[PDB]
Amino acid sequence: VQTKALSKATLTDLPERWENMPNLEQKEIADNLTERQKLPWKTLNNEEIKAAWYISYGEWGPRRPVHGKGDVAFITKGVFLGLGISFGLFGLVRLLANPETPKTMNREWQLKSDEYLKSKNANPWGGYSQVQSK
Amino acid sequence: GRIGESWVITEGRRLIPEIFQWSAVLSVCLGWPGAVYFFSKARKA
Amino acid sequence: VHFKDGVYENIPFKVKGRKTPYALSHFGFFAIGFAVPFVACYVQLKKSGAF
Amino acid sequence: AHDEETFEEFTARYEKEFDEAYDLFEVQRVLNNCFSYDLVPAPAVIEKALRAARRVNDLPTAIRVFEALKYKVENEDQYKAYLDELKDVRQELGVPLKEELFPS
Amino acid sequence: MVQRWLYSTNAKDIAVLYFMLAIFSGMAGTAMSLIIRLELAAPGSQYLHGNSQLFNVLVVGHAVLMIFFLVMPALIGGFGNYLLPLMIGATDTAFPRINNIAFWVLPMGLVCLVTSTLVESGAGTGWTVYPPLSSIQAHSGPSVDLAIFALHLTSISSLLGAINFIVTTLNMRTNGMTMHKLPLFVWSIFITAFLLLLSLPVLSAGITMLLLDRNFNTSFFEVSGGGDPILYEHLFWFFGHPEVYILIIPGFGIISHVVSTYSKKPVFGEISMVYAMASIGLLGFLVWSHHMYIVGLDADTRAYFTSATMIIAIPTGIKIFSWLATIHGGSIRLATPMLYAIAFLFLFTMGGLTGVALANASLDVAFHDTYYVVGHFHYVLSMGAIFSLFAGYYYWSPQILGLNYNEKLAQIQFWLIFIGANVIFFPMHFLGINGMPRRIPDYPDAFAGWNYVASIGSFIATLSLFLFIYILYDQLVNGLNNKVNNKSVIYNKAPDFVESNTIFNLNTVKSSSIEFLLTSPPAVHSFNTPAVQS
Amino acid sequence: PVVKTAQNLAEVNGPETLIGPGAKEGTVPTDLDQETGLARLELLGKLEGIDVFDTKPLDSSRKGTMKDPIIIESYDDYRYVGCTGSPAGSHTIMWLKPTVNEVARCWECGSVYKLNPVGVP
Ligand code: HEA
Ligand code: HEA
Ligand SMILES: [Cu+2]
Ligand SMILES: [Mg+2]
Ligand SMILES: [Zn+2]
Numbered sequence: 011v012q013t014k015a016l017s018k019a020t021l022t023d024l025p026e027r028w029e030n031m032p033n034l035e036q037k038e039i040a041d042n043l044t045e046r047q048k049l050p051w052k053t054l055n056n057e058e059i060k061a062a063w064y065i066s067y068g069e070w071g072p073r074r075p076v077h078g079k080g081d082v083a084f085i086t087k088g089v090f091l092g093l094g095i096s097f098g099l100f101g102l103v104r105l106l107a108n109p110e111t112p113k114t115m116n117r118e119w120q121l122k123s124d125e126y127l128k129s130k131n132a133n134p135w136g137g138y139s140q141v142q143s144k
Numbered sequence: 145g146r147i148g149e150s151w152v153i154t155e156g157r158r159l160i161p162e163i164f165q166w167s168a169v170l171s172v173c174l175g176w177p178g179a180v181y182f183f184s185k186a187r188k189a
Numbered sequence: 190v191h192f193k194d195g196v197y198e199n200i201p202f203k204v205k206g207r208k209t210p211y212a213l214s215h216f217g218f219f220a221i222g223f224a225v226p227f228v229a230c231y232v233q234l235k236k237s238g239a240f
Numbered sequence: 241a242h243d244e245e246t247f248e249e250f251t252a253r254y255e256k257e258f259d260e261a262y263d264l265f266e267v268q269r270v271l272n273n274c275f276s277y278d279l280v281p282a283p284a285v286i287e288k289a290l291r292a293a294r295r296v297n298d299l300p301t302a303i304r305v306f307e308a309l310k311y312k313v314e315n316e317d318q319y320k321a322y323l324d325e326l327k328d329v330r331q332e333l334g335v336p337l338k339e340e341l342f343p344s
Numbered sequence: 345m346v347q348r349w350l351y352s353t354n355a356k357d358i359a360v361l362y363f364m365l366a367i368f369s370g371m372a373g374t375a376m377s378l379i380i381r382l383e384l385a386a387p388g389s390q391y392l393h394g395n396s397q398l399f400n401v402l403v404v405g406h407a408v409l410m411i412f413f414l415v416m417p418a419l420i421g422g423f424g425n426y427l428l429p430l431m432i433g434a435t436d437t438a439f440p441r442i443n444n445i446a447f448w449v450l451p452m453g454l455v456c457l458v459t460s461t462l463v464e465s466g467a468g469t470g471w472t473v474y475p476p477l478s479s480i481q482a483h484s485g486p487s488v489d490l491a492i493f494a495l496h497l498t499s500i501s502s503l504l505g506a507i508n509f510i511v512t513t514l515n516m517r518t519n520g521m522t523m524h525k526l527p528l529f530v531w532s533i534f535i536t537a538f539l540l541l542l543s544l545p546v547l548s549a550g551i552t553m554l555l556l557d558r559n560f561n562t563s564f565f566e567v568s569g570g571g572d573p574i575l576y577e578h579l580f581w582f583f584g585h586p587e588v589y590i591l592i593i594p595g596f597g598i599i600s601h602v603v604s605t606y607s608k609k610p611v612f613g614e615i616s617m618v619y620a621m622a623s624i625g626l627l628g629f630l631v632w633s634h635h636m637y638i639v640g641l642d643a644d645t646r647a648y649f650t651s652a653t654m655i656i657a658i659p660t661g662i663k664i665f666s667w668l669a670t671i672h673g674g675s676i677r678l679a680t681p682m683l684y685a686i687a688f689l690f691l692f693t694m695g696g697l698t699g700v701a702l703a704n705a706s707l708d709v710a711f712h713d714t715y716y717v718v719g720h721f722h723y724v725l726s727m728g729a730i731f732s733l734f735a736g737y738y739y740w741s742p743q744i745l746g747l748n749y750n751e752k753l754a755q756i757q758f759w760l761i762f763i764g765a766n767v768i769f770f771p772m773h774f775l776g777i778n779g780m781p782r783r784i785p786d787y788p789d790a791f792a793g794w795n796y797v798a799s800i801g802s803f804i805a806t807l808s809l810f811l812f813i814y815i816l817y818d819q820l821v822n823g824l825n826n827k828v829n830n831k832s833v834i835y836n837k838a839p840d841f842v843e844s845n846t847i848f849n850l851n852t853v854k855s856s857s858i859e860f861l862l863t864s865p866p867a868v869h870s871f872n873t874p875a876v877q878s
Numbered sequence: 879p880v881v882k883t884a885q886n887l888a889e890v891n892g893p894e895t896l897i898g899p900g901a902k903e904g905t906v907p908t909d910l911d912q913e914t915g916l917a918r919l920e921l922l923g924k925l926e927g928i929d930v931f932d933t934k935p936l937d938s939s940r941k942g943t944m945k946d947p948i949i950i951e952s953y954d955d956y957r958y959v960g961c962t963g964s965p966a967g968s969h970t971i972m973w974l975k976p977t978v979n980e981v982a983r984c985w986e987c988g989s990v991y992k993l994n995p996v997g998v999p
Contacts, residue, residue: 040846048297052334059299059336066300066844073845076679076833081752088756089763092807096764100803103382112388115789142792144185148317177771180797191868192348196746196823199865200360201349204820215817222371226379226405229461233398236465240393263944264847269988271842304842311841433958520935520960525971610970851985854972861958861975873952874931877960877971878938 013045016058025064040065117143247279254285258292267292268301280312283322287329294333302335310338353440354868358447359426365451366418367816371809373410376402378806381768385799387789396785400468401461403783404491407471411591412498413454415729419594420502420540421447423736424509424533426744430866431530431857433518433875443508446501453497460490467491470783472580473554475565475573480558489558492551499548506540509533520877524615527857531618532597535625536590542629543586550579574639582632588725589628595732596621596663599685602735603667604856605837606682607674612666620659620666631656637708650705657700664693677838680754681739687762688731695723698773713783716776722769734758739836746864747823748832749815757811764804771797836860887926890919938966947981947992955995963987 020039028036043062046054069075114123120141127138145151183189197204204211234240245253254274261267271289274281286305293302306323313319323330348357380402383390392398425443429436437443460467464485469478478488513526513534526534553564554576563569565576604611611617631653637646667689676682698720702711711717742748771794778791787795819826826832837855839848853860862870884895896918901907913921923930941964942948950957955978960971969986976982976991983990
């Protein structure tokens with residue numbers, strides 16, 4: 011009967027209020043709740059039980075999650091952006107390599123080069139056709 | 145256990161949806177050579 | 190003499206109090222590290238062929 | 241002791257370990273060391289844990305017993321046939337659950 | 345400041361310098377890997393026009409630089425020098441000038457290795473520098489002499505660090521560390537430092553025999569004159585397999601510690617795990633000629649070695665099974681070193697399975713000097729030692745450097761290096777079983793697809809390292825702001841379930857080794873008084 | 879000024895008292911004669927009976943909590959203590975950092991550690 015209950019405006023909406031409260035008010039309502047818990051428990055109002063549970067066990071400070079508030083979306087955006095950036099830079103590094111190809115790279119050489127293979131039945135059951143060019 | 149839904153059902157419900165996503169992640173951690181072969185000109189694309 | 194300890198007195202780089210930005214030294218270190226095989230390739234490509 | 245612990249030795253050892261605690265660190269420590277074993281404890285352990293949390297006079301560790309237990313059990317029929325065994329201790333001790341306290 | 349970084353007989357300010365040469369040489373070696381895989385992207389003479397000798401010089405530079413100047417410093421030298429005195433309670437190491445000269449004879453091996461690739465076109469042999477490919481008739485010049493003087497200097501550095509480590513954890517332990525109570529990374533650095541001084545003397549003897557039959561007219565491997573080049577293969581691979589077991593055992597220690605501390609569980613049977621690791625160490629000498637199944641050994645000794653390499657394979661298996669057992673049943677907090685620890689298990693089990701596919705002396709005749717071998721060792725060396733290196737840095741550097749990194753950039757760096765390095769070395773197996781030999785500038789243009797896929801992957805694996813460089817910069821200039829402004833993770837060990845936040849702020853760090861109890865950047869005289877233990 | 883050379887461990891007064899007298903022209907030197915500094919300090923201690931640099935695993939006989947803690951001694955303001963249960967090897971080794979202004983509570987054993995910080999800085 012000695013300690014006073016916390017009023018409604020000091021303690022309303024506390025899981026939506028704990029992050030931007032000043033560090034001088036947080037110690038005050040922490041002291042007030044940890045002395046309100048020394049009463050019989052049934053006379054603790056249902057507004058402050060949620061407050062005590064969020065203060066002692068909420069997802070703030072030490073219990074903050076490592077993937078918080080859509081950062082899985084940020085990291086998959088970063089992964090696909092990195093894949094696109096590396097693809098584009100590989101393309102414009104590939105652009106400056108060498109003008110001419112080895113002459114046996116186009117399809118016209120490849121048709122003769124596997125006609126020669128089927129003349130001598132090389133790779134008879136597996137694959138023997140070599141084209142790989144457009 | 146003794147009283148409740150049986151352990152066979154309550155762990156089959158937990159693990160039977162896990163087998164298909166395991167097969168998905170293994171079929172795309174070892175099966176992307178098939179996906180890169182599928183679009184190339186060797187498959188008469 | 191025990192050398193005095195802090196958050197930036199454990200590394201050879203000076204970071205906070207400088208005249209030049211830290212990005213200059215920090216990226217020039219890996220610029221010369223990434224460009225030593227390129228200068229090896231250049232000195233090997235002027236000795237035999239062209240470039 | 242690396243030899244195994246039977247259930248009666250488990251519940252007697254932990255009842256005599258919940259009786260001795262005096263601070264809050266001790267109650268939460270022995271509660272964590274009781275819940276992070278393999279079995280779920282019989283309610284002879286957990287009503288003594290509720291009394292030992294009442295002796296230190298703080299509420300939310302007399303609620304996280306119930307939520308840690310809901311994470312412990314294998315279904316909710318075990319949870320309901322459990323919770324009607326700790327009915328009157330929850331009544332006269334006046335602790336709430338989670339699902340009725342935070343409706344979501 | 346000259347006496348704190350140039351004379352500097354203090355094992356904390358030597359490890360930072362080890363790490364600086366490690367990141368410098370790793371950048372140079374991955375520039376060489378980028379140039380190699382950029383030239384091998386398509387058939388026909390690419391970016392370096394013709395000039396196969398330059399490609400041989402580039403591949404021996406990549407191999408020997410990234411082995412003996414990135415992985416061995418940043419695992420043995422840097423991490424052992426910073427952590428082996430800091431886990432057993434020594435104020436710092438015994439023989440301090442010895443591990444100062446080990447560091448300071450590293451980069452002169454580096455500068456003579458760099459200037460070996462410029463004079464008289466250059467040493468091209470590959471990192472397993474063989475005769476009579478390297479004798480004076482088939483390879484003239486002072487290039488490969490400087491290239492193996494680099495190996496003499498790196499050999500001397502690693503042996504001096506080995507003697508340093510062995511005595512500093514055999515005598516200067518703290519008050520209660522018994523002979524089996526040390527954390528497992530101390531045991532890994534212990535056994536690795538034994539394998540160094542039991543192995544690399546044979547290496548330095550063989551390569552100085554190579555030097556004095558190059559220049560001093562002797563005839564160890566000059567065959568017209570009495571010798572034989574098979575003796576070099578024996579004398580080299582007697583070090584060559586213990587060298588990679590040296591490079592991978594501290595990886596096992598680092599991965600054991602990070603999966604112990606990110607799953608809130610002790611490792612499953614630490615005594616059986618350290619017995620398995622010590623038997624791997626004392627058994628890794630008996631299988632040195634599994635790299636020589638082709639050269640003309642008898643079928644009987646080939647049968648012995650293909651029997652013994654599978655008993656090499658079994659305790660690594662029970663180590664990986666104990667890792668699965670100690671992450672089973674935990675409370676796994678998926679932060680960025682735990683991600684590398686999880687990826688290391690899969691990406692090293694894959695390489696070990698293809699390694700025991702290689703280990704059959706029957707089966708090695710279809711796979712020797714073939715890109716299947718590259719797919720095996722660029723799994724178990726690259727992904728193994730460097731995923732353990734990344735899970736060492738991202739786990740220890742908030743305590744060592746005292747500046748917290750960015751977290752989302754660390755996770756995109758992990759996923760970029762994971763994807764972009766799994767796409768490189770996986771087509772190497774298909775190139776191997778289709779018939780591509782090693783060390784070719786490029787190839788007959790049948791298998792023209794998988795090289796292109798690997799080359800489009802190596803750019804991702806290089807861009808992830810550029811993002812790691814930006815992670816280093818963002819850690820170095822935004823450490824305190826990543827402490828404060830909620831971009832990082834601050835507590836690596838989360839509070840347990842029934843523990844309050846006001847009770848977590850009492851016992852902040854629930855460690856099991858000393859290192860996470862010292863303050864960020866730790867004091868230069870940390871253990872003034874000994875650190876007692878029961 | 880005037881300096882004698884600390885015949886046993888009681889009369890040491892800093893690093894200027896551990897010198898000792900030199901050997902003669904013909905005799906081999908004993909370690910009591912010529913050894914100086916920390917080695918002379920350890921030798922004089924071991925000849926008196928004690929040994930300095932007191933290395934001992936800490937007392938894990940009793941548990942001890944906040945009515946009477948486990949008292950540890952340090953010459954500095956902190957001392958890293960690795961607790962291993964109420965027997966010698968009960969649970970795995972958990973490292974605590976008891977300092978001058980805060981006790982250290984084990985969270986797995988439950989024992990607490992408090993200093994008597996000797997100091998003299
Ligand atoms: C240390 C071992 C190591 C590693 C990691 C690599 C990784 C790479 N290697 Fe390889 N390689 C060898 C050692 C290694 N290699 C050896 C021994 C040979 C045999 C030579 C012979 O026999 O002739 C060889 C051969 C070899 C071949 C086969 C060529 C042939 O012989 O025909 C190719 C082709 O792609 C290649 C290129 C690459 C590329 C692009 C990478 C990429 O993976 C590189 C990207 C790597 C990273 C991005 C790692 C991160 C880098 C850091 C610097 C992190 C810093 C962090 C800390 C310090 C904690 N090297
Ligand atoms: C980091 C050093 C390192 C490590 C750890 C390994 C690991 C292994 N390696 Fe490798 N290897 C090299 C370095 C290494 N290798 C190098 C540098 C080359 C090229 C040399 C050159 O230039 O020619 C090479 C190539 C190479 C060869 C030479 C082939 C040739 O060139 O002709 C052989 C031969 O036996 C081999 C086999 C093995 C085996 C059996 C393991 C085993 O230790 C792997 C153990 C792991 C497992 C076995 C998987 C985990 C276990 C389980 C999941 C349990 C179940 C498994 C079984 C029942 C088998 N690899
Ligand atoms: Cu080997
Ligand atoms: Mg060979
Ligand atoms: Zn304890």
